[PDB]
Structure 1
Amino acid sequence: CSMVLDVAFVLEGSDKIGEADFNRSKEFMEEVIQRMDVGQDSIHVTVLQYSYMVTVEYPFSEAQSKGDILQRVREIRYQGGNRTNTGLALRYLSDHSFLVSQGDREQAPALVYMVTGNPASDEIKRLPGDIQVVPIGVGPNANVQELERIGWPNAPILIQDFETLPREAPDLVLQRCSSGEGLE
């Protein structure tokens, strides 16, 4: 995927996920970033982790080089929170992450890949249309119809388990990046 695009990665880091599965989420994300054409004139990346609260791990406003991003990703510490506040994570995206004051490019399309394995603890609201969300529902505990509503027009990418996530999902994520649409 090589284009002008602002991409957000949102990882659930709750106790229900656990440290091992969160590390698998991280490794999935690292692999995607490696395959993407990340640079100042191309793809820009922001990274968020959420559970009880939301942490901006890497804002758009910081240096948009692959090396700097990937190293910050390695430095991300699993929070292990007692909630899955997906609605709050979405609010961060619309009301913080994709603002020009936080490094967002006004003329670039906005795309979010959100990795979750549990139903939302909180109230969810569909984002403004300009922020495209591709939910990645991992494991048997994902609330699929909830993700379908968050995702529209994007179908959720459903992954059987966190072990499969780093192996299977990057290909699908990059296909969606380049084409602008999911498969079949």
Structure 2
Amino acid sequence: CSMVLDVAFVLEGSDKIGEADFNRSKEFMEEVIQRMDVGQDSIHVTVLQYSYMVTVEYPFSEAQSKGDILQRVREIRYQGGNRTNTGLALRYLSDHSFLVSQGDREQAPNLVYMVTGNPASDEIKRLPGDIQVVPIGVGPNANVQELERIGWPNAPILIQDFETLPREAPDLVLQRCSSGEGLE
């Protein structure tokens, strides 16, 4: 995927995810960022981790070089929160992450890859259409219909488990990134 795109990665870092699976989410995300043409004139990356609260791990406003992002990604500490505050994470995207004041490029399309393995603990609202969310529902505990609603028009990328996530999802994520749509 090589394009002007403001990509958000939203990783659930809840206790229900656990550090191991979150590290797999990180590794998936790293792989995606690695595959993506991340650069100042191309793909911009914001990284959010959420559980109880949302951490902007990397805002769009910070240096948009693959190296800087990937290194901050490696530095992302699993928060292990007791909630899956997906709605809050989504609100961060709409009301923070994708604000021009936070480094969002107004003319760049907005794409969110939200890795979640659990139902939202909180109220979820489908984001304004200008923020495209591709929910990555990982594991059997993903609330798929919730993800479908959050995701619309994007079909959730359903991954059987977090072990498979870094293996299978990057391809799907980058396909989605490049084409603007999910497969079939």
CA shift, 1:20, in A, is: 0.5
Deviations 1:100-139 (A, max 9, x none): 1110111110000000000111111111111000000001
Provide the rounded CA distance (Å) in 2 between the counterparts of 1:138 and 1:79.
Answer: 18
Deviations 1:137-160 (A, max 9, x none): 001111111000001110001000
User: Structure 1 unaligned runs (5+)?
Assistant: none
Q: TM-score, normalised by structure 2?
A: 0.99
| Aligned alpha-carbon RMSD (Å) | 0.5
Provide the rounded CA distance (Å) in 2 between the counterparts of 1:100 and 1:167.
Answer: 33
SS of match in other structure, 2:166: helix
> How many residues end up aligned between the 2 structures?
184
CA shift, 1:17, in A, is: 0.6
Deviations 1:7-65 (A, max 9, x none): 00000000011110000000000000000101111010000000000000000001110
Provide the rounded CA distance (Å) in 2 between the counterparts of 1:10 and 1:141.
Answer: 17
Off by >2 Å, runs of 4+ in structure 1: none
Residue matched to 2:65: 65
CA shift, 1:86, in A, is: 0.4
Asked if 1:32 is matched to 2:47, the reply is no
Provide the rounded CA distance (Å) in 1 between the counterparts of 2:34 and 2:94.
Answer: 26
Matched ranges for 1:12-23 at <5 A: 12-23=12-23
Residue matched to 2:158: 158
Residue matched to 1:129: 129
Provide the rounded CA distance (Å) in 2 between the counterparts of 1:138 and 1:108.
Answer: 28
Q: TM-score, normalised by structure 1?
A: 0.99
User: Structure 2 unaligned runs (5+)?
Assistant: none
SS of match in other structure, 1:91: helix
SS of match in other structure, 2:158: strand
SS of match in other structure, 1:55: strand
Once the two structures are aligned, what percentage of the paired residues are identical?
Answer: 99
CA shift, 1:82, in A, is: 0.5
Residue matched to 2:89: 89
SS of match in other structure, 1:37: coil
Provide the rounded CA distance (Å) in 1 between the counterparts of 2:139 and 2:104.
Answer: 32
Provide the rounded CA distance (Å) in 1 between the counterparts of 2:106 and 2:10.
Answer: 21
